[PDB]
């Protein structure tokens, strides 16, 4: 229930015994969800797949669907990526991306 206020109004308004507080939650949320019955049923809509209520679903700016296909080449590619990455450990580095992201977030684009 409190997620409703936090997602949109970016605040959490507690009013209980001994404390009244409108707390700040200026936060971007990256949610990960499990569909009902484990497998994502393509015949059913996404609303039918998950139990999230319509007010909650309206909060999210983007919904993405990851479905486990039975593809042989995809399985081989996943296994290869895991194994060769694990063996490798011994375009841009994460520090460069951090610096660019912090630099880029200072821009406030207008709307033409």
């Amino acid at each position: 229930v409190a997620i409703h206020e936090a997602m949109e109004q970016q605040t959490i308004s507690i009013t209980k015994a001994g404390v009244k507080a409108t707390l700040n939650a200026r936060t971007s949320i990256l949610a990960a969800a499990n569909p009902i019955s484990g497998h994502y049923d393509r015949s059913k809509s996404l609303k039918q797949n998950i139990n999230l209520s319509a007010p909650i679903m309206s909060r999210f700016d983007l919904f993405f669907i990851l479905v486990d296909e039975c593809n042989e080449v995809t399985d081989y590619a996943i296994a290869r990526r895991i194994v060769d990455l694990h063996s490798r450990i011994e375009v841009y580095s994460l520090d460069d991306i951090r610096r660019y992201l912090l630099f880029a977030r200072q821009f406030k684009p207008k709307i033409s």
């Binding site: 630099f103 200072q106 821009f107 406030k108």
Partner: protein, 35 residues
């Protein structure tokens, strides 16, 4: 380096302990009064 300076200019366009500041900017006005 002109384009890098232009990027700095764009960054500064979007860019948008104080008792001593107050005293200095006020002492300017008092200097004007004396003059």
């Amino acid at each position: 380096n002109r384009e890098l300076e232009a990027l700095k200019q764009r960054f500064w366009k979007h860019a948008n302990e104080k008792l001593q500041v107050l005293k200095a900017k006020l002492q300017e006005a008092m200097k004007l009064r004396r003059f």
